[PDB]
Design brief:
The complex is a heterodimer of chains A (302) and B (512). With 302 residues, chain A is α+β, with helices and mostly antiparallel strands. In chain A, the strands form 4 sheets. In chain A, strands 3, 8, 11, 12, 13, 14, 15 and 16 form an 8-stranded mixed beta sheet that branches. A 4-stranded antiparallel beta sheet of chain A has the order 2-1-7-4. Chain A has a two-stranded antiparallel sheet with strand order 5-6. Chains A and B meet through loops of A and loops of B. The site of zinc ion has 8 residues of chain A, from loops. Chain B: Belongs to the WD repeat WDR48 family.
Chain lengths: 302, 512
């Protein structure tokens, strides 16, 4: 608990400490540390350092540094002095998958990555063609082009497009222009659903430059994607971690995480090395304006 | 607004359907069956089990799928609905089109008929429903006085089905809005909104006094509605996939259903569990028409996506075993052209049809060159490959199942070739430069007197029966005639009114 800020590394502290509270992450990287015998070694070197310092505090209190991970990452991909948490999350998860594929537990693909379906349905013959893509997070809009809901926002992503009028979908089966529904659907799910909020903006011919949207969505606690699922399943997901940004740009600012333990049923708000605690009731009523607004939402299969 | 020229490569008579059949009408006084072909042709058949060739006539005029047909006035009048956005009125005895209504703005999908009022209605993807007095429509000549129009509103999405009762007091529409909307056709008043289906509704029927309704839907259910109570009184899930076609006996007690799952059932409405599998067809069922010679109907005619039309007998009233295994009568169909390749000479086309037969065609002379049988299609393309480039100058479409060639001003004149390399011979034997699109246009209009300068193009003719169609890009057909007919006074008048200036330039003024 408590990740030392290394000079504008709150982007890395927030994402790593959310990763630390992921259902399968702890056990997975320990499994991979025993398989090997060098990002997975650095991950375990930090986790051991984190777990051991928690035990030292647990016995007798007095008044850990993710520096091990940073030096490994910089040798892995020298992007680094302050970046976006979303880009670094991809480089971490992507490289764990790149090594997992080269070794042959399928860690990253099972619990972060899901399967996406691009379905077109000719309304004249009702023949369904689908296209498969993989996805590890849901890019979601906040405002349109007041306080919109998250169901609306996911509906924007998993849109349905009705093809009627001068432009009709040509069905190869019907051999003729036809009316069609073109929809986006979720098939296979990961253990943790990441929601990436497009909460940044830009304008024209004054100031400045970029701008952040200081009006977040109505975030629910329960989440079911049955409405967009390829075949309605009763799986339900529960919010457990939220990364938030303070600032008016994407390049730099304060990144902070608010993770829930699943203290059972509470909120562990921690920033850099400065750790705090909050309640359930006075946190969801805190997101609406206000030093920061959310950027990433993580739900898990409860 | 932009006018294209097209023509169809075909025989003078296409006795058999070249595509699936969208709708059926049975004339009980003459024992005649009408089929509405996806190939744009309506055909009249004799249902005498005597005759070996049941063909009587084809009724040619539509440019695209004919989606619905209604026989009116004891078989005197036929009304047709097509994906070319028009409704046409036919003399059903002589088989020619008398008038064309153009009030729709998208595919016209369904027609409805109130026998006691000689009332018909049309509906399509444009969400419009028009009501037409049949006797007003036939009353057209010289100054028609036109027709005053009437349409129904409320439909929020594209309409796929439509029914009226025999008395003409109730009209119901079915659409992708998943609700059936009901009006009184006499007053245009909205009556009720029937909710219950979770998908498109492609099949609708009303009882004689418009008090009950049967709907068939792509959600796989049949629903019975009471119009007096404005609610659903029974739901039937006898199919696996969407239900597309419904029939009911005269007593409104047995419903015949068919659809995407190829299976055709007869279900008793009073006792659902007693239901009979009549047959399993070879292709999705699009429409069915009971033979009503006798009270318990003796047979049902079935239209599918295949070009053949099967009559199934019912002489023998849950089920694994089909009641029937072979049709009782069979109207033979022809093959559809489903694949097309333009060769490198931009002159010949290789086709594959539904029989996996491969043929070779001459686009310039608008005719077939040789049948190649069941050779491999892609191996045949590479076998006739010649490393030569000729600019694209036409487009081909297979929407009717026959070869339709379309010319557009943008590239109609793009292909100059030498007479020698084009397989031609000229009187001076000079071998100057020929423009393919320009020669074809002159052959298509060879019989148009205004193009006659002492006549034709001097190198080849098209077959006189080739249909020549002038339409607007995206939708509206303007004028269709046969090549040989251009010398007529009606055709010459209509050509002067319809031939776009970019064709006049080449065919009349002889500019190039
Ligand atoms: Zn289709």
């Amino acid at each position: 608990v408590g990740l030392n800020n290394l000079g504008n590394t709150c982007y890395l502290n927030s994402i790593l400490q959310v990763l630390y509270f992921c259902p399968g992450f702890k056990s997975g990287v320990k499994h991979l540390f025993n398989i090997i015998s060098e990002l997975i070694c650095s991950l375990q070197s930090l986790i051991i350092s984190v777990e051991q310092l928690q035990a030292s505090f647990l016995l007798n209190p007095e008044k850990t540094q993710p520096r091990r991970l940073l030096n490994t990452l910089r040798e892995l991909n020298p992007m680094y002095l302050q970046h976006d948490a979303q880009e670094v999350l991809q480089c971490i998860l992507g490289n764990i998958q790149e090594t997992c594929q080269l070794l042959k537990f399928e860690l990253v693909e099972k619990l972060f990555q899901g399967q996406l379906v691009l379905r077109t349905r000719c309304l004249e013959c009702e023949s369904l063609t689908e296209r498969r893509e993989d996805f590890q997070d849901i890019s979601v809009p906040v405002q349109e082009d007041e306080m919109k809901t998250l169901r609306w926002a996911i509906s924007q992503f998993a849109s349905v497009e009705r093809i009627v009028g001068e432009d009709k979908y040509f069905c190869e089966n019907c051999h003729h222009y036809t009316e069609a529904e073109r929809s986006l659907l979720f098939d296979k799910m990961p253990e943790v659903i990441t929601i990436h909020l497009k909460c940044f903006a830009a304008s024209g011919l004054e100031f400045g430059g970029l701008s952040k949207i200081n009006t977040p969505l109505l975030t629910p606690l329960k989440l079911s994607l049955e409405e967009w699922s390829t075949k309605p399943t009763n799986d339900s997901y529960g919010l457990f971690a939220v990364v938030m940004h303070s600032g008016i740009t994407i390049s730099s600012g304060h990144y902070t995480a608010s993770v829930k333990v699943t203290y059972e049923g509470k909120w562990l708000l921690f920033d850099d090395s400065e750790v705090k605690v909050t309640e359930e009731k006075d946190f969801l009523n805190s997101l609406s304006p206000p030093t920061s607004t959310p950027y990433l939402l993580f739900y898990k299969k409860l | 607004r932009k006018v294209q020229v097209s023509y169809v490569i075909r025989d003078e008579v296409e006795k058999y359907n070249r595509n699936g059949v969208n709708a059926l009408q049975l004339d009980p006084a003459l024992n005649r069956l009408f089929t509405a072909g996806r190939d744009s042709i309506i055909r009249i058949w004799s249902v005498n089990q005597h005759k070996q060739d049941p063909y009587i006539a084809s009724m040619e005029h539509h440019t695209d799928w004919v989606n619905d047909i209604v026989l009116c006035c004891n078989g005197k009048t036929l009304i047709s609905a097509s994906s070319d956005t028009t409704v046409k009125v036919w003399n059903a005895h002589k088989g020619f089109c008398m008038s064309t209504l153009r009030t729709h703005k998208d595919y016209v999908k369904a027609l409805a008929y109130a026998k006691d009022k000689e009332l018909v209605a049309s509906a399509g993807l444009d969400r419009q429903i028009f009501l037409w007095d049949v006797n007003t429509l036939t009353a057209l000549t010289a100054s028609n006085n036109t027709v005053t129009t009437s349409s129904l509103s409320g439909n929020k999405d594209s309409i796929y089905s439509l029914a009226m009762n025999q008395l003409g007091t109730i009209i119901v529409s079915g659409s992708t809005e998943k609700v059936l909307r009901v009006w009184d056709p006499r007053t245009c008043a909205k009556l009720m909104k029937l909710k219950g289906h979770t998908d498109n509704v492609k099949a609708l029927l009303l009882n004689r006094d418009g008090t009950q309704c049967l709907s068939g839907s792509s959600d796989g259910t049949i629903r019975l509605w009471s119009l007096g109570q404005q609610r659903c009184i029974a739901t039937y899930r006898v199919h696996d996939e969407g239900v597309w076609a419904l029939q009911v006996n005269d007593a409104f007690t047995h419903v015949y259903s068919g659809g995407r799952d190829r299976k055709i059932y007869c279900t008793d409405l009073r006792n659902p569990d007693i239901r009979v599998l009549i047959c399993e067809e070879k292709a999705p069922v699009l429409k069915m028409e009971l033979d009503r010679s006798a009270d318990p109907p003796p047979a049902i005619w079935v239209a599918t996506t295949k070009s053949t039309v099967n009559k199934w007998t019912l002489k023998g009233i849950n089920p694994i075993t089909p009641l029937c295994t072979q049709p009782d009568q069979v109207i033979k169909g022809g093959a559809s052209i489903i694949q097309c390749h333009i060769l490198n000479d931009k002159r010949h086309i290789l086709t594959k049809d539904t029989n996996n037969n491969v043929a070779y065609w001459d686009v310039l002379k608008a005719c077939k060159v040789e049948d190649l049988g069941k050779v491999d299609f892609e191996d045949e393309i590479k076998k006739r490959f010649k490393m030569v480039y000729v600019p694209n100058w036409f487009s081909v479409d297979l929407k009717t199942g026959m070869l339709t060639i379309t010319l557009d001003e943008s590239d109609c004149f793009a292909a100059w070739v030498s007479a020698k390399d084009a397989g031609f011979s000229s009187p001076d034997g000079s071998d100057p430069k020929l423009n393919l699109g320009g020669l074809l246009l002159q052959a298509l209009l060879e019989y148009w007197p205004r193009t006659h300068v002492n006549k034709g193009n001097g190198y080849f003719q098209v077959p006189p029966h080739t249909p020549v169609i002038f339409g607007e890009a995206g939708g509206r057909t303007l004028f269709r005639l046969l090549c040989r007919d251009s010398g007529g006074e009606t055709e010459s008048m209509l050509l002067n009114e319809t031939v776009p200036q970019w064709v006049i330039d080449i065919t009349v003024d002889k500019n190039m």
